[PDB]
Structure formats: C-alpha cells, structure tokens
C-alpha cells in the first residue's frame, strides 16, 4: 500500500522501507526489513551494506551498531518489494534488541535516535531515520503532617491530551490554615551516560480552616502548548523535524522519562503519585 523510498543524489542506491516507527512490544520489536535496489554498474566489485544505528547524543555514544551485507546476500513485504524490482533488489533484515532506549529527545537532536544507513563500498549513502516507540498497555497517597492530606488518581495510565483527575481530601485538625493548593505535574527526565520539570500547575486559593474537611476533584492536563519554552523538556521522536508530543513514560542506559503528580498544600505537607503517559495503540 505505502512504502518509504530514499536514495542518494546519484540515485544509484534506493532503500524501500515498510514502516518508520517500530512499536516496542517489550518482547518483540517490529523487524526493520527493507529493500536495497542497486544498479549493477555502480557497485561492480564493491559490496552493498546496510547499518542500523542506535546513537545516543547530548558526544556520539553509539549504544549499538549492526551491519547487514545487502550484497552479496547473507518476508512478504520484502517479497512484494523485490518482485517489482527483480534480482538487483536485495533485502535486509535488522532486529532491534528489546533492551534499547526508545526514541526520545529534548526541545532546544539531543537524546536518542535509530537510523538505517545504506552504503556501497568494498569493505566495512541513504540516511533513513526511524524510531522505536511504545503504546499504552490506582494511585493513593496519605501523609499525616495533625494536618491529614490524602490524594488519589482515578487511574494510573492516561493517554496524551487526556486530562487527569485528582481527588483531594484535607482533614485540617491543626491550627494552621491552608493558603493554597497546588496539583502539579512533574516530568523527570534522567540522562544516563535526574532533573525535575513542572509542566502543569492548577494553583487554587482553596483555604481549609482548622478542624475542617475539604474535598473536591481537580483536573490538570499536561500539554505542549505552554511547554514550548522549557529547555531540556523530553519530547518523543522527531522524524525529520516534525512537531512532536511529550516524551512518553519509559517502561523499563539512554534517557529515562517518568511522570508523577504532586499535591502540595501551601501552609508544607505534600504527596506524589506516578502516572503513565503513552499514546494508545490506534
């Protein structure tokens, strides 16, 4: 139906690829199978190789490199791609190890990226950027500061864009009066070769007087709208400079992304809950 094509200025080498975002099922990565369509006269003696790179940047810390000898030779999609091209189209087949850092970067490049580089040479080009990504497969906190603060989330896993509900229960039996309540979202993006990030803050002047009970659900939603000017914000994989989401929550070497909800009473008693923020398998 569809297939991504990329070739060199000479066009002697062409790479045909089925997908460009391979879902990490956590037990099997969609194999990187493509097709190299060469002209015999431009390679003659020199061989044709294809390389799968998993470069980590910030410094080119190539966490993985694998070369597949397209020619001489060493899937149904590959079959159909070849039948339209003949002999001088040769398949390649890379397998991403499950234990790799998913495609993630930072909003200013920096981060992680996969790559398919196809080159013809006698001994060990088309630069096809792919990505490894994951799909979406009850938090409760209580702190007795007395100043009893309890916070719960309806569910742990929320899709991007989907709003998060925060059930708050403050039983203020002490002499101190709550001045504000802040339900904030913290995005921790650890670069492993951990920094906090506030992305959403529904600060409300809700004051709970002594020996009182306060209880209502807040609705907070982390969006790229107001995060555009946050250096080091973890964004998902950018194919050729598209506009991307918030780095999904890694499910465990590269960059680890975690998301938590913090409930703070500005009097300070606080609690925190983790939530998962990956897109749903369409």
């Amino acid at each position: 139906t569809r297939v991504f094509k990329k070739s060199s200025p000479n066009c002697k080498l062409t790479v045909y690829l089925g997908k460009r975002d391979f879902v990490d099922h956590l037990d099997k990565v969609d194999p990187v199978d493509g097709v190299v369509l060469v002209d015999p006269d431009y390679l003659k003696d020199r061989k044709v190789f294809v390389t799968l790179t998993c470069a980590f940047r910030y410094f080119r810390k190539d966490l993985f490199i694998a070369n597949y000898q397209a020619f001489p030779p060493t899937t149904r999609l590959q079959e159909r791609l070849l039948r339209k091209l003949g002999q001088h189209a040769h398949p390649f087949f890379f397998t991403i190890p499950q234990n790799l850092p998913c495609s993630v970067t930072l909003q200013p490049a920096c981060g992680v990226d996969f790559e398919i580089r196809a080159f013809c040479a006698k001994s060990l080009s088309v630069r096809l950027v792919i990505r490894k990504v994951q799909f979406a497969p009850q938090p409760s906190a209580e702190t007795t500061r007395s100043l009893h603060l309890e916070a719960s989330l309806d569910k742990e896993l929320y899709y991007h864009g989907e709003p998060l509900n925060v059930n708050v229960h403050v039983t203020n039996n002490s002499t101190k009066t709550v001045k504000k309540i802040k339900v904030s979202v913290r995005q921790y993006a650890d670069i492993c070769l951990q920094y906090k990030c506030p992305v959403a803050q529904v600060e409300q002047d809700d004051q709970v007087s002594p020996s009182s009970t306060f209880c209502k659900v807040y609705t907070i939603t982390p969006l790229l709208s107001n995060n555009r000017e946050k250096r080091g914000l973890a964004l998902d994989g950018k194919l050729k400079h598209e506009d991307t989401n918030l780095a999904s929550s890694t499910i465990v070497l590269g960059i680890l992304v975690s998301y938590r909800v913090k409930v703070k009473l500005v009097v300070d008693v606080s609690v925190e809950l983790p939530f998962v923020l990956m897109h749903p398998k369409p």
């Epitope: 990504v133 864009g161 989907e162 709003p163 790229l224 555009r228 991307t244």
Partner: antibody, heavy 129, light 108 residues
C-alpha cells in the same frame, strides 16, 4: 461514539458580539484539531477558524482574523469561539467539526489538518440592526 | 490561498446516472481533498479523504480519484437519495478552502 454539540446561537446587532461553545463527547480537545466552519444563507461552506490545544496552534481565516478568536477548555472538553464585531455578512449557520490527530499509526500527525469527519448540528447566527 | 475551483456549477441526472464533478486546485495539492455531500439545510457529511479514500460509512457507489491537481468525484448509480450539494475541500494548507457547490438536481 463521537459527537459535537454547538450552542450559543441568537440575534445580535451589527458590531455586537457572541460566543459559541462546541462541547465534544467521545474525544478530547487536546487530541483533535477543532474547526469552526460556517455556511451563509444559501451559499457554500467557508472555513472560519481551527485550533489544536496540545500544541496551542491557532488558525484564522483571512476574513475572520481579529474579529473572531478561538480557544478551548480541556477541563470541560469544549471549544469556545468568541465572535467580535459581528456584521450582517457574518450571518450564517455555524458548524463545528473535528479532525482526529490519531491514525498516524502511532501518534499525533501535527501536519495533516485533515478532513473534518464529525460535524455538530450547526447553530444559526444572525446579525441585524 | 488555493482557489479550489469546481465544475460544473450544477448538473442534472435521474436514477442510475453517473455524475462526474471535477475539483481543480489553483496550486499543487498532495492528495488532501474531501467531498462533503451537504443535504439541503443539514450539516455537511464527509465522503472522501486522502483524495481517494472512501470515508467510513459512505456507500460504495461514491468514489473519488486524482489525475494531478484535478481531482474527480464519481457516482456509479446516482440513487434518488444522492441529491444534495457536493463541496470539495483541500485540507493541505491554511486557511482551508472549499469548492463552490454543484447541486445534483432531478430531471424531467
């Protein structure tokens, strides 16, 4: 099921102002490009404005740039279009529809602005002195 | 903008006829086209997307295709219920632009 409910349609003198609320059921205003279109009396549709919450992307037609202003409330899951300096020519039936950002295969297609596959019912906006 | 011209301005046909409406874009489009079958008064109903994709739920009699910048909408059997206006809309750039309607009347 996905639906949009368009409300806020009543008379207003020219130079007045209105506000139309498009409440979205079955999806979120953060994972969809919401477009306010209109149809004058006995004419063809015209695109008025279109927004996306997640990126904070706003787009206005050249004829309704500055006079109209769109935004959304993700807490209520709704899209609010404020119409200012309403004129007789702005009279129409105003529709609200959505383009899901999904179906890229994995995630958001930030650059489709595709065909609006779900329309509301259209609320009649008048202007007359 | 993109003056998404359409032809004919209107056409007539009975049951079983094969209507053909051509949507021509002033500037290049890249399969971003949709065809809305606005019944009189009601809200426009999506028919085609990607310039050739039968939108889910639209009857198979409808069809669309591309031959460059001039997309075509065809109806294999113009049923008595397939009488409305058909607007073509490029979803590529902004501001989006629609066609100008091509009413599909009845003949006597």
């Amino acid at each position: 099921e996905v639906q949009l409910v368009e409300s806020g349609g009543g008379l207003v003198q020219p130079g007045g102002s209105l506000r139309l609320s498009c409440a979205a059921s079955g999806f979120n205003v953060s994972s969809s490009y919401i477009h306010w279109v209109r149809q004058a009396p006995g004419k063809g549709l015209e695109w008025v404005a279109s927004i996306s919450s997640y990126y904070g992307y706003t787009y206005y037609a050249d004829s309704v740039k500055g006079r109209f202003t769109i935004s959304a409330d993700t807490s209520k899951n709704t899209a609010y279009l404020q119409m200012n300096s309403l004129r007789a020519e702005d009279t129409a039936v105003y529709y609200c529809a959505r383009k899901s950002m999904y179906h890229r295969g994995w995630g958001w297609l930030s650059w489709v602005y595709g065909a609006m596959d779900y329309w509301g019912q259209g609320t009649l906006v008048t202007v007359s002195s | 903008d993109i003056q998404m011209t359409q032809s004919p301005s209107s056409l007539s046909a009975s049951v079983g006829d094969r209507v053909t409406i051509t949507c021509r874009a002033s500037q290049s489009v890249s399969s971003a086209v949709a065809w809305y079958q606005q019944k009189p008064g009601k809200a426009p109903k999506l028919l085609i997307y990607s310039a050739s994709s039968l939108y889910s739920g639209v009857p198979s009699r409808f069809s669309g295709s591309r031959s460059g910048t001039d997309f075509t909408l065809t109806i294999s059997s113009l049923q008595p219920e397939d009488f409305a206006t058909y607007y073509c809309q490029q979803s590529y750039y902004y501001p989006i632009t629609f066609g100008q309607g091509t009413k599909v009347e009845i003949k006597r």
